[PDB]
Amino acid sequence: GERVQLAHHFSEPEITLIIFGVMAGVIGTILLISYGIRRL
Amino acid sequence: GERVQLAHHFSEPEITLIIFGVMAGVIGTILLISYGIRRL
Amino acid sequence: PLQQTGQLFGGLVRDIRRRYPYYLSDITDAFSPQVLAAVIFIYFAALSPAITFGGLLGEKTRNQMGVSELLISTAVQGILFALLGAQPLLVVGFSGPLLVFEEAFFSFCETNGLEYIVGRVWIGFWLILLVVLVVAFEGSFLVRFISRYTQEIFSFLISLIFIYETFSKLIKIFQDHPLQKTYNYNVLMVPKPQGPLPNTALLSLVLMAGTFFFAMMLRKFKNSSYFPGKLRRVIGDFGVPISILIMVLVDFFIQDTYTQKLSVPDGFKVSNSSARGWVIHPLGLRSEFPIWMMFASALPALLVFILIFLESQITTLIVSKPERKMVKGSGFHLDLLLVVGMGGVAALFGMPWLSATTVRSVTHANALTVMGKAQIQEVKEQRISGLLVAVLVGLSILMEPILSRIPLAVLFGIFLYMGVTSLSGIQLFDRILLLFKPPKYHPDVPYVKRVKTWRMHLFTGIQIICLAVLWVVKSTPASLALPFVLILTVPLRRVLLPLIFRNVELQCLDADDAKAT
Amino acid sequence: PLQQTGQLFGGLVRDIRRRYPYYLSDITDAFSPQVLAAVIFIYFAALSPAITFGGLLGEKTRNQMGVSELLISTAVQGILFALLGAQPLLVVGFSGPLLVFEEAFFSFCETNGLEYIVGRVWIGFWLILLVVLVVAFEGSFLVRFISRYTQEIFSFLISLIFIYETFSKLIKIFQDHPLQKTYNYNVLMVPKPQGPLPNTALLSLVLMAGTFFFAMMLRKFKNSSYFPGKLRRVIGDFGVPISILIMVLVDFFIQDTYTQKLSVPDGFKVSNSSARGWVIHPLGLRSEFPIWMMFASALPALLVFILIFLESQITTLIVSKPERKMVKGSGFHLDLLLVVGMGGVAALFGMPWLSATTVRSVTHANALTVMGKAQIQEVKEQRISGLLVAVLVGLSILMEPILSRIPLAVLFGIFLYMGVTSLSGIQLFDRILLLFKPPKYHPDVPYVKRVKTWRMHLFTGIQIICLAVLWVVKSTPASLALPFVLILTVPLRRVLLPLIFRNVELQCLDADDAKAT
Numbered sequence A, B: 001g002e003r004v005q006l007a008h009h010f011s012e013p014e015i016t017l018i019i020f021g022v023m024a025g026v027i028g029t030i031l032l033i034s035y036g037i038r039r040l
Numbered sequence C, D: 001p002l003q004q005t006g007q008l009f010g011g012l013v014r015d016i017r018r019r020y021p022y023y024l025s026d027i028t029d030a031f032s033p034q035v036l037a038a039v040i041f042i043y044f045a046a047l048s049p050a051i052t053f054g055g056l057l058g059e060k061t062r063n064q065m066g067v068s069e070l071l072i073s074t075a076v077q078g079i080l081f082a083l084l085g086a087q088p089l090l091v092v093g094f095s096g097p098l099l100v101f102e103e104a105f106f107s108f109c110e111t112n113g114l115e116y117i118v119g120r121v122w123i124g125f126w127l128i129l130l131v132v133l134v135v136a137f138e139g140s141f142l143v144r145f146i147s148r149y150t151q152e153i154f155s156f157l158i159s160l161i162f163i164y165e166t167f168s169k170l171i172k173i174f175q176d177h178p179l180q181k182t183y184n185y186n187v188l189m190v191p192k193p194q195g196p197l198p199n200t201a202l203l204s205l206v207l208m209a210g211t212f213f214f215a216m217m218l219r220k221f222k223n224s225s226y227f228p229g230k231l232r233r234v235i236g237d238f239g240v241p242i243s244i245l246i247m248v249l250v251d252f253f254i255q256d257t258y259t260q261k262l263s264v265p266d267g268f269k270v271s272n273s274s275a276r277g278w279v280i281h282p283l284g285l286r287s288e289f290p291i292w293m294m295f296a297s298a299l300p301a302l303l304v305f306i307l308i309f310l311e312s313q314i315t316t317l318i319v320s321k322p323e324r325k326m327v328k329g330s331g332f333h334l335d336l337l338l339v340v341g342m343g344g345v346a347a348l349f350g351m352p353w354l355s356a357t358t359v360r361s362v363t364h365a366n367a368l369t370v371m372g373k374a375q376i377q378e379v380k381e382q383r384i385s386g387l388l389v390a391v392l393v394g395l396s397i398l399m400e401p402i403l404s405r406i407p408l409a410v411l412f413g414i415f416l417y418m419g420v421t422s423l424s425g426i427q428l429f430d431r432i433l434l435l436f437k438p439p440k441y442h443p444d445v446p447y448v449k450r451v452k453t454w455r456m457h458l459f460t461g462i463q464i465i466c467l468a469v470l471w472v473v474k475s476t477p478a479s480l481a482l483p484f485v486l487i488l489t490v491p492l493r494r495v496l497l498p499l500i501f502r503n504v505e506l507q508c509l510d511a512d513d514a515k516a517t
């Protein structure tokens, strides 16, 4: 980025892909729970 | 008046009365002449 | 009112019998707040031009006639005209053509080594002779040949001149204190600033714009549908005093910035105590007055009589149209006699002769005009308003602490308001507006629904050429020929216009009461 | 548009099918000069608040986010919203509550030793989670309970706030350069003048007043009967650009006097290159970002979502009323999804999140509104205007020599014009005007002819109390609670108001389409 930045295990695209995958998993879990409810 | 003014034989009221009397005489003469015309 | 009886002083007697029966109403009809608001309006509207013309006269004639003499003459003639006049709504005061004539006569007296004030005395002596003959022989009956054409041309020209002078004063203020990057913070202030000062011109512009905006907004609020009707009309009548007070307070609470204030003389004394006294000898002050100039004063007397006659009679025609709901009568012979006789008498005391100014009288009439449920209903025709205006003008010297805190820019905005409001009733200004409008938006008026559009536009354009010609003459050293060129419009209407327009077209376009033939 | 389908993403799909068939018309309907005039209007109307808020953000956050990031985010989000939105008349830009939240979050991060920009990244990440759940569960259907009451209260309050800030900027300009008798002519100018300067505040006031006057006069001239109709309407459409050009030329022809101008950054670079880059690591830039704040950021994300949701949805309700002749439809699900998702994405790049501002979108809708012979005729509903505004905002950095000659006072007059023109369609403003009118002058409208005068006045005064309460909240450090107090008006309409008013009175006073029950 700019000047000196702390070096992490994951780069920015990797960590943002992981965060987006976790968000998508949470959204899918919530939608599946909502689909399960209102039917039984 | 003010400061030093030139001396006159007639004062201001006297000269203005004389001038107004001459003017009134001229006006009366003109009126009498106009009365004479438009009749004969 | 303009009929010829054939009797000596016939018009003068008829004027007295027409208006003086309404003398009791001319005092009891002033008991209303609108009259007081009109008094407050016309007090400034007549005082400020009086101060300006007195200063100009003092600077141009070495203070032989100045602010004090003009103020005293205005007060005396206004009081006498309000008490004895047949059209009390006229405001008699100094005018531009009078200043031009005074400049020319002072130049003539300086060139020939004559006494200027004594020459004025002899002119005033010759003025009394002319007016008495004209009144006795009913010379005011020639005013009936001054139709709506000449009246509206004169009114539009005079309003344009007033607005142009109002803007030129602001231009002069901006020029005297230009917007500069740096200024001298130590500049002598007495009697006037000797150098440019910061924030002066911009504050003057702000004050003028705010005064005009507040006056116009309160005038629109009068006809609006807000507040109870009584309170709404009371506030609308006092729109100009409220705007003046607001802008005066605004300038008062800005201490640091300098703005020019109203300046009045210290006391009731002649402008130059080293030149003349209160009564000027007709035979001369320092040197004996020559006999030849006593008879030679008739031609300047003729010019002054022509100027005063045209101004006063056209102003009386404008303010006393039947469409203005004036149901009390106007006297052409009595007002002319009073004005010219008072001028001739005040010439003896070294005081300037006055005339019925058009803008001030039209503003006085409009400030007393009552609008009913858009439509003119009545006019507060009374003598108390003009009498109070003249009394306050005379007392303006003694109320210096009040006047010394009033800026000129406030009065500039008031002048702009007067100029824009004096154009309401002029059909020439209405037909000028129709030049920029499509024909389908033209109003339901006799000169539109009975005349072709291009014919009306050509008739308006002929009037515009006359306005340009009169404007050019004013901007020339021979500006005293303006009354003659103005009179020359009457042959244009009565002779040349029928050669190109039909009788019905001229009746619709030039109507004495806006009638459809 | 506000119906509940019961299917996941049901509102999102219906909004797409409602508007995207009109996508071809969304380009062809913009081939008109009024669209170009609206572009020139909204470009400045969005650029100047963007510059001001960017400067304030840079001052309040130590340049972590500043003018350049805000401009880039505004351009990108405006382009993507115009290309993909369902109501393209909305203007996406920064707002005051967002600035307050940024202040609070920067203070919180400084107190707890947290990296501000990484916290913003995590909040924006939490923002994307909230909007997807709301859109999928049709959470945008709850806006149907926001009737005319809350909408008009919010619009009136926002317009009053805009006018108040516009006047306070001029007050601050006057305070920076007070009117003084003496000035220091040796004042440093770079970067800004460190001392008072003459003729500055007065010239700013003159420029603002003249800009407002010209804008209002051209707005009147649009509906006037002068000139040919096509040319007159073309001139009226370009009234705001014409006023801006006239006042800019007036200020340009005054070289000596200094006036504050627009200030854009030199290039497309971050405000502080020593703090952050274009892409911010979610794990931290300098210090390791703790895990607990990654979950604790949901509550500030909830607050941001509430603010953006209320602003955008109430603005969409205002701009899409049936009385505004909107015949193309609006999307409450698609627009909210796009706005919040783009804000969350831009948060990852260290750029501010945006919302559909009320005043800018209302002005954009009004600038595209076609007026018939009093009655709204149609609205130029198209995507080209907002796209061009966003493109010009992005290109504002490259055109500094053009923007550097435009004073802020001209923009102040333009903002005053926007504020006074944003109160047209609000019935609350109309009923406030009826408080100063006699009952016989009230118009023949359903909320007057079916409701007693004092009942309507009490109903209006209840809203005035809500306006005062909302104004007091903004003047407190807890101004982020303004959306909650605004929401509290919804129970007032449906719980407390029926306890004092009849059903017909509430139907007439709070009508979805201004009907007589």
Ligand SMILES: CCCCCCCC(=O)OC[C@H](COP(=O)(O)O[C@@H]1[C@H](O)[C@H](O)[C@@H](OP(=O)(O)O)[C@H](OP(=O)(O)O)[C@H]1O)OC(=O)CCCCCCC
Pocket: C227, C228, C229, C230, C231, D435, D436, D437, D438, D439, D440
């Ligand atoms: C400060 C003012 C007093 C504050 C106290 C507030 C209390 C207060 O002022 O009510 C009294 C009065 C109500 O009485 P009301 O409406 O009957 O009075 C009518 C009103 O004066 C109209 O203006 C008149 O018509 P116009 O104009 O001549 O054509 C009309 O005369 P007419 O033709 O029917 O015979 C009058 O009847 O005022 C109002 O008009 C309401 C607007 C008040 C707005 C006040 C906003 C401040």
Ligand SMILES: CCCCCCCC(=O)OC[C@H](COP(=O)(O)O[C@@H]1[C@H](O)[C@H](O)[C@@H](OP(=O)(O)O)[C@H](OP(=O)(O)O)[C@H]1O)OC(=O)CCCCCCC
Pocket: C435, C436, C437, C438, C439, C440, D227, D228, D229, D230, D231
């Ligand atoms: C600068 C333009 C050229 C100048 C050269 C001057 C020569 C010149 O401009 O004449 C052409 C044209 C005349 O044609 P015309 O009067 O028929 O034009 C009408 C006019 O445009 C109205 O505004 C229209 O109504 P609206 O507004 O849509 O409701 C009306 O349409 P409609 O509803 O009846 O069907 C039009 O018919 O101009 C004018 O409009 C007169 C005022 C011009 C003012 C003078 C220019 C200052």
Ligand SMILES: *[C@@H]1O[C@H](CO)[C@@H](O[C@@H]2O[C@H](CO)[C@@H](O)[C@H](O)[C@H]2NC(C)=O)[C@H](O)[C@H]1NC(C)=O
Pocket: C062, C063, C272, C274, C275
């Ligand atoms: C008052 O009048 C006197 C004389 O009429 C003026 O004195 C003259 O001033 C002008 C201007 O320089 C010159 O002609 C002479 O200096 C003076 N001439 C005589 C004969 O005295 C005096 O200036 C006037 N007062 C004011 C204020 O202008």
Ligand SMILES: *[C@@H]1O[C@H](CO)[C@@H](O[C@@H]2O[C@H](CO)[C@@H](O)[C@H](O)[C@H]2NC(C)=O)[C@H](O)[C@H]1NC(C)=O
Pocket: D062, D063, D272, D274, D275
């Ligand atoms: C850009 O950011 C740096 C730090 O990231 C700022 O430097 C700080 O400035 C403040 C203001 O006095 C002080 O805390 C220190 O001088 C600096 N702190 C550190 C840790 O270096 C810098 O001021 C920012 N740039 C601007 C224009 O504000």
Ligand SMILES: CC(C)CCC[C@@H](C)[C@H]1CC[C@H]2[C@@H]3CC=C4C[C@@H](O)CC[C@]4(C)[C@H]3CC[C@]12C
Pocket: B018, B019, B022, B023, C125, C126, C129, C291, C294
């Ligand atoms: C029109 C008015 C002014 C009247 C007409 C003026 C003529 C006809 C009259 C009126 C007053 C007269 C003057 C009155 C007094 C004097 C002083 C005397 O020692 C010589 C004659 C002389 C100078 C007169 C000359 C003629 C005169 C000027």
Ligand SMILES: CC(C)CCC[C@@H](C)[C@H]1CC[C@H]2[C@@H]3CC=C4C[C@@H](O)CC[C@]4(C)[C@H]3CC[C@]12C
Pocket: A018, A019, A022, A023, D125, D126, D129, D291, D294
């Ligand atoms: C609402 C959105 C942001 C998703 C919810 C965030 C939570 C559930 C998840 C998303 C991604 C996750 C991170 C992914 C990777 C790592 C690196 C590891 O060395 C420490 C834990 C850490 C830092 C995780 C912490 C928990 C985390 C932040």
